Structure 1
Amino acid sequence: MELRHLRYFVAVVEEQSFTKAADKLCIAQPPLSRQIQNLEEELGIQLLERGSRPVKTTPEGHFFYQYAIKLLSNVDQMVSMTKRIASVEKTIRIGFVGSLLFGLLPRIIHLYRQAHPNLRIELYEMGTKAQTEALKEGRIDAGFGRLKISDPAIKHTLLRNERLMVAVHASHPLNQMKDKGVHLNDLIDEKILLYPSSPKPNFSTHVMNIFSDHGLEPTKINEVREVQLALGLVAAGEGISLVPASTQSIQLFNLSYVPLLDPDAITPIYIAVRNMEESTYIYSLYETIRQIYAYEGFTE
């Protein structure tokens, strides 16, 4: 078949008539019907319900239609992307901490891909310290993390203040405050599961920092390997855990998330680049972030 067949079919489904679609396609109705008849026989499948006056699709017709608008949209994308390629083949390398996979970062990267069709993008999971060294050595070009950096060779900027939340078993008394929220102070005597167990500093450093900023130091603490351990163990009755809000991407039976009322019970997200960085590719990454944030209704 040809793209003509797909375009002819889609117009008929959208206009809901053989003659009405012919007007927008600028052709006569007899040959338009033949093409669709030729498409159906070439497929050996009935796509349109015959013979409806306001034409309706069959089960396979509806399926083929949704596929077709997507395939024809890909052609449009192909053409548009080809005309905006960078002549010199570039690679951009991005470091990130694992917790960022649960929020906006992936769709930011995906959007970034589309802005530079021929750009090779390499993604590396690394902590903040590793990010700092990699940047200075030029092994990454941007790092996304949750900790501030002290280093004259690095420029870090606050992107957003994500809220912290408490993961609890549904039967925990604190789950009564699911819609109201609680204070860090309410958590002082709980069994608290910190994570990950990876090289420090990491997210568990931050959580304990947050308690410490409020004059608090929990003593019933257990460090577990990764987020899923923390949440799985909470779901199994082992205690509670503090998580970034986006970790709600994980929902488990009898696991519940409770908001925190302390204004500074937060986990900031930063972008780190080299101090003297001015690559258009990195400015473009910043704008992609801004684009996504705007769609989400963020400032900040």
Structure 2
Amino acid sequence: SVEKTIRIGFVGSLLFGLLPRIIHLYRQAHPNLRIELYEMGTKAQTEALKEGRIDAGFGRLKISDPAIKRTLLRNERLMVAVHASHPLNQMKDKGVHLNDLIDEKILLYPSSPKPNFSTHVMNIFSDHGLEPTKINEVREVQLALGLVAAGEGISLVPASTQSIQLFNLSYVPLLDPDAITPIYIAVRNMEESTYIYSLYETIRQIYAYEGFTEPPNWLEHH
């Protein structure tokens, strides 16, 4: 007996973070629900929500539309993926700053419509009057990491990319406080169903385990 099908849009990179354990726990606690997962970019999620193709969208862009509302879940730290022989890797335990990377061969990704993670990264550089001269855009994250592991350059990546460990690939912390990539949950701009509120609580629960501290009024009830 399925009480309801809940449909969830998500950006692909979130699979390397908490998304799967959140969905697994949500399913487990709510065996009366059928949950369907649809990979789609943040802009695509907006249209999908409006016409009911999905019920919640987990995205990385803050893109306003009156018919949608969103809540920032957390800011994920960025890191520098480097070859283990790279000078920057001597700072693995201490971290580095964006201005240390301006003369390095940087692999941006993905190849997809902009804005995306690539523009996101370049905007953080531009916010501090930094203009990396050696830039190359590649198809997606694992191509970027493979090329770093091969000796082709370095890449800025979400911290949860560390789910991928390749031989002679290292991840160096980036210390600039604004060196982050957000995670949002977006829903239609109306009162959330009992089912979506249940999803909020699952996120709350996992976040508490991760020791994340809740901001004021974070994920409403009722």
Structure 1 residue 199, shift from structure 2 partner? 2.3
CA contact (8 A) 1:149 1:156 kept: no
TM-score in terms of structure 1 length: 0.69
Structure 1 residue 88, shift from structure 2 partner? 6.1
Whole-Å Cα distance in 2 between the matches of residues 219 and 136 of structure 1? 40
1:226 paired to 2:140: yes
Once the two structures are superposed, what CA deviation does each residue of 1:196-244 show, in whole Å capped at 9, x if it has no partner? 1122222112111211222222231111111110000000010000000
- 1:169 corresponds in structure 2 to 83
Between Structure 1 and Structure 2, whose CA radius of gyration is higher?
A: 1
Structure 1 residue 121, shift from structure 2 partner? 0.8
- 1:243 corresponds in structure 2 to 157
- 2:217 corresponds in structure 1 to none
Instruction: List runs of 5+ in structure 2 lacking aligned partners.
Output: 214-221
Structure 1 residue 259, shift from structure 2 partner? 0.4
Whole-Å Cα distance in 2 between the matches of residues 115 and 201 of structure 1? 36
CA contact (8 A) 2:2 2:34 kept: no
Q: Point out which structure has higher relative CO (alpha carbons under 8 A, 6+ apart).
A: 2
> For 1:243, what is the secondary structure of its paired residue?
strand
2:53 to 135, 139, 154: 139
Instruction: List runs of 5+ in structure 1 lacking aligned partners.
Output: 1-86
- 1:122 corresponds in structure 2 to 36
Whole-Å Cα distance in 2 between the matches of residues 128 and 246 of structure 1? 19
Once the two structures are superposed, what CA deviation does each residue of 1:170-220 show, in whole Å capped at 9, x if it has no partner? 111111111111010111111100111122222112111211222222231
Once the two structures are superposed, what CA deviation does each residue of 1:23-42 show, in whole Å capped at 9, x if it has no partner? xxxxxxxxxxxxxxxxxxxx
Structure 1 residue 89, shift from structure 2 partner? 2.6
Q: Provide the identity percentage.
A: 99
CA contact (8 A) 2:2 2:32 kept: no
CA RMSD in angstroms comes to 1.8
> For 1:262, what is the secondary structure of its paired residue?
coil
Whole-Å Cα distance in 2 between the matches of residues 140 and 211 of structure 1? 34
Structure 1 residue 120, shift from structure 2 partner? 1.2
Whole-Å Cα distance in 2 between the matches of residues 276 and 209 of structure 1? 32
TM-score in terms of structure 2 length: 0.93
Q: 271-280 or 103-112, which moves further after superposition?
A: 271-280
More helix by percentage? 1
CA contact (8 A) 1:191 1:222 kept: yes
Once the two structures are superposed, what CA deviation does each residue of 1:38-90 show, in whole Å capped at 9, x if it has no partner? xxxxxxxxxxxxxxxxxxxxxxxxxxxxxxxxxxxxxxxxxxxxxxxxx7631
Whole-Å Cα distance in 1 between the matches of residues 122 and 159 of structure 2? 17
Number of aligned positions between the proteins: 214
Whole-Å Cα distance in 1 between the matches of residues 64 and 127 of structure 2? 19
Structure 1 residue 140, shift from structure 2 partner? 0.6
2:72 to 143, 158, 181: 158
> For 1:134, what is the secondary structure of its paired residue?
helix
Whole-Å Cα distance in 2 between the matches of residues 167 and 192 of structure 1? 10
- 1:255 corresponds in structure 2 to 169
Q: 193-202 or 123-132, which moves further after superposition?
A: 193-202
Once the two structures are superposed, what CA deviation does each residue of 1:103-128 show, in whole Å capped at 9, x if it has no partner? 11110000000121021111011001
> For 1:100, what is the secondary structure of its paired residue?
helix
Structure 1 residue 245, shift from structure 2 partner? 0.4
Whole-Å Cα distance in 2 between the matches of residues 272 and 214 of structure 1? 29
Whole-Å Cα distance in 1 between the matches of residues 102 and 195 of structure 2? 45
Whole-Å Cα distance in 2 between the matches of residues 254 and 189 of structure 1? 22
Going from structure 1 to structure 2, the CA distance change for 1:176 and 1:118 (only over 3 Å counts) comes to same
